[PDB]
C-alpha cells in the first residue's frame, strides 16, 4: 500500500588523506527513483550554479527502480574550506524539487 514514490537521495563525499582534510575525487549524488520523467539534476554551490564537471551518469537499471547519479569535480581547498554542495532533483511529476546539502566531515 503506497510508496509510489521512492526517491533515494544519497550524496558521496570525498575520502581525505589522514586526519586533515586536503584532496578532491568527487562529489557525488545517487538518486534512486521509478516512474519519473525524465529528470533535471541541479548542484549549487555557495548559492552558485557550477560550472562543468558536473556529470550525470546513464541511468542504471535495477529490477522496475532506476537509479542516476551525478559526480561533480571540484577544488579540494573548496571543498575543504566548507563550501557548500547540494543536489536538487527536479522532474514534472514531482510536486516539490528534493534537496540534499553535504557537509565537510
Not at 503506497?2 to 544519497?10: A, E, P
Not at 549524488?29 to 552558485?48: A, H, M, P, R, T
Request: charged fraction near 25%; hydrophobic fraction near 35%; glycine fraction near 4%.
Amino acid at each position: 500500500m503506497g510508496r509510489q514514490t521512492d526517491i533515494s537521495v544519497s550524496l558521496l563525499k570525498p575520502p581525505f588523506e589522514e586526519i586533515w582534510t586536503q584532496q578532491t575525487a568527487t562529489i557525488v549524488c545517487e538518486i534512486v527513483y521509478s516512474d519519473l520523467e525524465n529528470i533535471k539534476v541541479f548542484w549549487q554551490v555557495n548559492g552558485v550554479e557550477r560550472k562543468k564537471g558536473v556529470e550525470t551518469q546513464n541511468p542504471e537499471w535495477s529490477g522496475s527502480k532506476s537509479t542516476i547519479v551525478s559526480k561533480l569535480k571540484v577544488m579540494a581547498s573548496e571543498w575543504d574550506s566548507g563550501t557548500e554542495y547540494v543536489c536538487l532533483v527536479e522532474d514534472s511529476e514531482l510536486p516539490t524539487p528534493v534537496k540534499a546539502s553535504i557537509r565537510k566531515a
